[PDB]
Structure 1
Amino acid sequence: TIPSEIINWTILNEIISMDDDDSDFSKGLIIQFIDQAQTTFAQMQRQLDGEKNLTELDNLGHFLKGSSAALGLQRIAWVCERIQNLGRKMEHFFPNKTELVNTLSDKSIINGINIDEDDEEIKIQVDDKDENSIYLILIAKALNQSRLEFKLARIELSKYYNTNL
Structure 2
Amino acid sequence: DFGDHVDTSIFGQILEMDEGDDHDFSAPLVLNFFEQAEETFQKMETALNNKDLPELSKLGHFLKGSSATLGFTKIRDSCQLIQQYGHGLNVDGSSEPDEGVCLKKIAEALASAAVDTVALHKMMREFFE
Return the TM-score normalized by structure 1.
0.69
Residue in 2 that maps onto 1:20: 19
Q: Would you say the 8 A contact 2:5–2:74 is kept in 1?
A: yes
Distance in 2, Cα, partners of 1:23 & 1:140? 35
Residue in 2 that maps onto 1:157: 124
Residue in 2 that maps onto 1:70: 69
Return the TM-score normalized by structure 2.
0.87
Q: Would you say the 8 A contact 1:92–1:135 is kept in 2?
A: no
Distance in 2, Cα, partners of 1:56 & 1:41? 12
SS in 1 for 2:88: coil
SS in 2 for 1:20: coil
Structure 2: which 5+ residue stretches go unaligned?
none
Q: Between Structure 1 and Structure 2, how many residues are aligned?
A: 122
Is 1:141 the counterpart of 2:111? The answer is no
Q: Would you say the 8 A contact 2:23–2:128 is kept in 1?
A: no
Distance in 2, Cα, partners of 1:147 & 1:73? 13
Q: How large is the RMSD of aligned CA atoms in angstroms?
A: 1.9
Distance in 2, Cα, partners of 1:161 & 1:8? 17
Distance in 2, Cα, partners of 1:14 & 1:146? 24
Q: How big is the shift at 1:91? A: 1.1
Residue in 1 that maps onto 2:60: 61
Specify the code of the residue in structure 1 equivalent to 2:127.
Y
Higher helix share: 2
Alignment of 1:1-165 (within 5 A): 5-20=4-19, 23-50=23-50, 52-91=51-90, 131-162=98-129
Distance in 1, Cα, partners of 2:90 & 2:42? 23
Structure 1: which 5+ residue stretches go unaligned?
94-129
SS in 2 for 1:33: helix
Q: Find runs of 4+ consecutive structure 1 residues off by over 3 angstroms.
A: none
Q: How big is the shift at 1:147? A: 1.0
- Relative contact order, CA 8 A, sep 6+: which one is greater? 1
